[PDB]
Design a protein around this nucleic acid. Sequence first.
RNA 1: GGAUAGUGGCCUACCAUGGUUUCAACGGGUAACGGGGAAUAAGGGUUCGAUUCCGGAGAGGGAGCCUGAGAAACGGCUACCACAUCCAAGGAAGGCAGCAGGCGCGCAAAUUACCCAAUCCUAAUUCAGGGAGGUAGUGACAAUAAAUAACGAUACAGGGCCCAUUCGGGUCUUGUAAUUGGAAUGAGUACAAUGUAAAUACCUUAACGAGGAACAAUUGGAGGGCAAGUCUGGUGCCAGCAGCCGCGGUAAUUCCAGCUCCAAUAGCGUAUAUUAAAGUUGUUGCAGUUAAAAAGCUCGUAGUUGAACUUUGGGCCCGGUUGGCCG
RNA 2: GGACUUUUACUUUGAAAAAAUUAGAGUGUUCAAAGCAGGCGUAUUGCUCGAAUAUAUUAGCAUGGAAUAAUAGAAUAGGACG
RNA 3: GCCCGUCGCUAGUACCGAUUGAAUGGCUUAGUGAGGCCUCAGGAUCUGGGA
Lengths: 185, 67, 60, 144
Amino acid sequence: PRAPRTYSKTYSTPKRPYESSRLDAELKLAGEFGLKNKKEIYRISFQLSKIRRAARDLLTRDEKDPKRLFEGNALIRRLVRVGVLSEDKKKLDYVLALKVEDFLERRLQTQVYKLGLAKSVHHARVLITQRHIAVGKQIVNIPSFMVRLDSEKHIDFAPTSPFGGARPGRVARRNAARKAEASGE
Amino acid sequence: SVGFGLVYNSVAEAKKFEPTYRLVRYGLAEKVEKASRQQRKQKKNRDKKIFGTGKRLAKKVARRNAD
Amino acid sequence: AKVHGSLARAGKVKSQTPKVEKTEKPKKPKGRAYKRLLYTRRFVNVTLVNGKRRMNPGPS
Amino acid sequence: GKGKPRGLNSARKLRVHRRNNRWAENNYKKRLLGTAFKSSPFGGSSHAKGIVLEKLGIESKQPNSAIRKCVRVQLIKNGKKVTAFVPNDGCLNFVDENDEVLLAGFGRKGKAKGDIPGVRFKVVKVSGVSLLALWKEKKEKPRS
RNA sequence: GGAUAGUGGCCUACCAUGGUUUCAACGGGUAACGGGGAAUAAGGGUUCGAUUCCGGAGAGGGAGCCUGAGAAACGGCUACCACAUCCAAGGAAGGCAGCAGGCGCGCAAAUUACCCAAUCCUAAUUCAGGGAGGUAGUGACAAUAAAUAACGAUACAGGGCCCAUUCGGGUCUUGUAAUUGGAAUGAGUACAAUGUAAAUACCUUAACGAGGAACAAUUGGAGGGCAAGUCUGGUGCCAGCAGCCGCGGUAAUUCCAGCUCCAAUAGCGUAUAUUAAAGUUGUUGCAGUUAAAAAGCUCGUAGUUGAACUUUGGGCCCGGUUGGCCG
RNA sequence: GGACUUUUACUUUGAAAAAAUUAGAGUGUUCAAAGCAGGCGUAUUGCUCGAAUAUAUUAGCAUGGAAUAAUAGAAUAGGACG
RNA sequence: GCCCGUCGCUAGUACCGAUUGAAUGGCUUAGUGAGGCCUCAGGAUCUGGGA
Ligand SMILES: [Mg+2]
Ligand SMILES: [Mg+2]
Ligand SMILES: [Mg+2]
Ligand SMILES: [Mg+2]
Ligand SMILES: [Mg+2]
Ligand SMILES: [Mg+2]
Ligand SMILES: [Mg+2]
Ligand SMILES: [Mg+2]
Ligand SMILES: [Mg+2]
Ligand SMILES: [Mg+2]
Ligand SMILES: [Mg+2]
Ligand SMILES: [Mg+2]
Ligand SMILES: [Mg+2]
Ligand SMILES: [Mg+2]
Ligand SMILES: [Mg+2]
Ligand SMILES: [Mg+2]
Ligand SMILES: [Mg+2]
Ligand SMILES: [Mg+2]
Ligand SMILES: [Mg+2]
Ligand SMILES: [Mg+2]
Ligand SMILES: [Mg+2]
Ligand SMILES: [Mg+2]
Ligand SMILES: [Mg+2]
Ligand SMILES: [Mg+2]
Ligand SMILES: [Mg+2]
Ligand SMILES: [Mg+2]
Ligand SMILES: [Mg+2]
Ligand SMILES: [Mg+2]
Ligand SMILES: [Mg+2]
Ligand SMILES: [Mg+2]
Ligand SMILES: [Mg+2]
Ligand SMILES: [Mg+2]
Ligand SMILES: [Mg+2]
Ligand SMILES: [Mg+2]
Ligand SMILES: [Mg+2]
Ligand SMILES: [Mg+2]
Ligand SMILES: [Mg+2]
Ligand SMILES: [Mg+2]
């Protein structure tokens, strides 16, 4: 006797299992944004998919219909918010266009690399999952953080770890305990 | 770290209005620990088998030890 | 048709292929790093284009 | 317009005809006749566990020549006797009679496999332990 | 009239001959509790719903009833039927479809643990009780996030590019490398505080904690469908594979392995069921000369269906909501 | 308040309408599945936005419409108005 | 070349079938009929017609 704790799934598999061309095109995405799963691509293309459905569905009602204006604006502004949608094409026939890489371009993974600070999509991963870098003073260790435009300015290493100062940390602090122990006393 | 706090108008009104495990955590209340929650139930259940006081049923069994 | 055929030979060819043990090799990176290895194998530096392109050739 | 009444009130007829003709559908008919539950060696269920009566040597169908190694199993919930195939080289050495195997379908919806005539099932586990394991050597057959 | 809390064939007397049905009554089946809902995504549909909420029904099977505002109550009683325990053989006692736990059944499902701290319920009641309920254990049911690595130097090799009368390497890096280089981090271990009813975990965080011998990713597949070899060894229509087509009888692209290679990846195969594909159930939307399919023929009830025609045209006023050109 | 009214189908808007589910708004649970939170300062004595919306059909209700399709009317005048 | 049926082998499935065959479950005639409830009586005892 409780409230059903609700869930739902966040990805979708391709209809055809072995399409050599979709396969190449898929890996290349991972190679480019440092993913580990086709799922990480499956995930997004699914997000993308429904967004389009929302957008299609809205586009069949008449221009300046109440739901359309409310739900339309809401969709667009949220997309802009994370910097997927262009300021100009801010009217949802380009949310209808859109595509996967427009989404990929906003993962913390990708931002933490884009303005240097990593110099490799993979080094970008490792840094993020290893508690370095943050948004505010709030540390973020999830590569798919979807950097929300007005947070892009505040992506630095965190006040902890090295890099953002305040200790080298044990593996160096080990070697520094091997210099004044061997050579000194 | 975000948490919650209260502050009472006196210790008398704290000691009456607070949870009784909280007055424990601090020191202004003894944990008076008891028989296991299920040991206790069995106390109540064993007691149900007896009508009245009890000790009067000791002496009638103090005759049993003859026959 | 026939159902009470010989059984003597059950297990024949597995039990008579000479053993050869696996060879010890560099461990392959797991996760992301493998997808990376594939990307650079498949698409970055490429390899050959004899006629078109191959993936598990031996002696060609 | 051929056939189907196009009237606006002809719903009933149009419904009924469908009910009628669903019966010409193999699966629908099976579903409602409860063919699963009624005939069919398994309950209608996915697997069934039974006991080994005799090890058989079924000669394959042409154009293949072979001896196919099977087991007569007497299902436990049923007494129904069934002949099941024993996948992969050897493996028939893992069974023995009176042993307790666990049978499953052949993924052909009823209907026997390839060149094995009559066998509609395969062994999956003996003595509670899985053929596959025993084959690879990830596991050893129990005491008795 | 009686009975009921009360209407009523509810029951009884008297009287009558009615009630339902191809617009499917009545009977049979249901591996049937109904609903909110669930799964599948062009749409129309198809299939499912024991099961977190609502309703109903039950407490081994039937019936009976006491108490009471409320039960035809079962953690109430009475009887019979079926089970079944204790005994000094005279008798007495029992009802887990509550919580756990055992047997059985089977393809199939967890602890004989803690607490009333929360949620709330009950009583004479702030206090007691609450296997309601919360806490933990067992737990790859499902669902979410996503570690197994990251970066320089060097050894040639390039591909660049300026020059090329010709050595070439030198800058900008593409990277294959059997010596190298210091960095980073939690998996874990663990002072401590936090957490909690008390604990465990999580979040924090001192001390520890990564170089291949790990802290070492799997699960299927590599003839076609279908992404990946015509490598090497083995067998020789045997052993086996093969959803389907097909492979195997001595150079096996298919079996048994080695190497290498693919696909998905903390998950991947398999069996069964269902859904999409299926316009192969066809209202949308099927097919019937010869592929499956027009009753030998006409009549004909139900059923579906069913020609055209009856206030149209013109005139006047009122005030709205978008949009233009100005603001 | 009296006195009377041919029957229907269709369609429009609307009431009455559980929650979770679903669709969907707002909110950076570090992300996310979720959750219904939360956000601001004088962070020494409080300030404040929320907790929408939609779907919810077959039947019953309530209202607008009068095309399409039915029904009924006056022929032995037992017609209609006074 | 194709190809039809009897006849013969192995294996599997369903049918028919003496046994007025068997088993389970649901109703149900007739007979017997527990028990509580209602009711006519009863009156161990125990009071002021009642218990
Ligand atoms: Mg107690
Ligand atoms: Mg008491
Ligand atoms: Mg037929
Ligand atoms: Mg046999
Ligand atoms: Mg049984
Ligand atoms: Mg009457
Ligand atoms: Mg009659
Ligand atoms: Mg019918
Ligand atoms: Mg049932
Ligand atoms: Mg239900
Ligand atoms: Mg149902
Ligand atoms: Mg059931
Ligand atoms: Mg009941
Ligand atoms: Mg029972
Ligand atoms: Mg009976
Ligand atoms: Mg009862
Ligand atoms: Mg009970
Ligand atoms: Mg009860
Ligand atoms: Mg005795
Ligand atoms: Mg129980
Ligand atoms: Mg299970
Ligand atoms: Mg209490
Ligand atoms: Mg008191
Ligand atoms: Mg409990
Ligand atoms: Mg590992
Ligand atoms: Mg290591
Ligand atoms: Mg291929
Ligand atoms: Mg060879
Ligand atoms: Mg070979
Ligand atoms: Mg091979
Ligand atoms: Mg899959
Ligand atoms: Mg239609
Ligand atoms: Mg067809
Ligand atoms: Mg024909
Ligand atoms: Mg004809
Ligand atoms: Mg007409
Ligand atoms: Mg409506
Ligand atoms: Mg709502």
